[PDB]
Amino acid sequence: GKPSRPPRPSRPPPPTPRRPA
Amino acid sequence: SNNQLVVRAKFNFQQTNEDELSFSKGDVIHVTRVEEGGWWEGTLNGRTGWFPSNYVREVKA
């Protein structure tokens, strides 16, 4: 029972978390 | 007093810690910091935090 899952989220992925200097 | 930018969420974003700001598409966010690097800071419903700058669109004043 391997279901059929949807395509990638249509939105862009969030960037990696903020890391200030 | 001082001018302040306002943005509207284009997508949903769910914070992973208390320094990030969660929102639903359509939420109106008052911007507090803009910087290069992919993240801006703003306030929504009494919460403050960073969010992806590419996840919002501007609102005409």
Added chain:
Amino acid sequence: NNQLVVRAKFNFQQTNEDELSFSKGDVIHVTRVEEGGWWEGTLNGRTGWFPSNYVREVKA
């Protein structure tokens, strides 16, 4: 069977149940790879999409 596994470098929180939440250190079994910054995988009973650059390849 050979499998691709990745380890979370950063936390990620789903916005719906087609996306996979995880914490730094979680090991995820990859189910789909596509261009665009999103991969799909399985962690502890759930399957969903997540940002590919939040994880690093490891070995099972």
